[PDB]
Amino acid sequence: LVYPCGACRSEVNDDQDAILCEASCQKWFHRECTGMTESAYGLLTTEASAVWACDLCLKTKEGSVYVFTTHLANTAAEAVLQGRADSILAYHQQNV
Ligand SMILES: [Zn+2]
Ligand SMILES: [Zn+2]
């Protein structure tokens, strides 16, 4: 099969950091095509109860587990790294 990046349209390969808009548009995105940080990527992909939503799905409220936009994933991860949140789910819980 082939999996075109939802933003740049080239193939997303297994050796590339990538996230899936799995609860909506069903497209893979290269991490660097989304604005997501490395830390947000590492923490979100490790959390099986978390799903990510891409910017185009957010724009039309497509589809309307814990849901993170790129911005929420970034800020939750920064709080984790700073020792200000115990985990990205704990941050989501507190902040919505
Ligand atoms: Zn891409
Ligand atoms: Zn999407």
Numbering used by the authors: 326 to 389, 235 to 266
Paper lines:
To our knowledge, Pygo PHD fingers are the only ones whose histone H3 tail binding is regulated by a co-factor ligand, namely, the HD1 of BCL9 proteins: human BCL9 HD1 significantly increases the affinity of human Pygo1 PHD for H3K4me, while Lgs HD1 is essential for H3K4me binding of Drosophila Pygo PHD.
Given the emerging physiological differences between the murine Pygo paralogs and the murine Bcl9 paralog, we measured the binding affinities of all four PHD and HD1 combinations for dimethylated histone H3 tail peptide (H3K4me2) by isothermal titration calorimetry (ITC) and found that the complex between Pygo2 PHD and B9L HD1 (PHDPygo2–HD1B9L) has the highest affinity for H3K4me2. To further explore the underlying molecular mechanism of this communication, we solved the crystal structure of the human PHDPygo2–HD1B9L complex. The overall structure is very similar to that of PHDPygo1–HD1BCL9 (with a 0.593 Å rmsd for the core Cα backbone  compared to that of 2VPB13). HD1B9L is a compact domain that consists of an N-terminal β-strand, followed by two α-helices connected by a short loop that allows folding back of α2 towards α1.
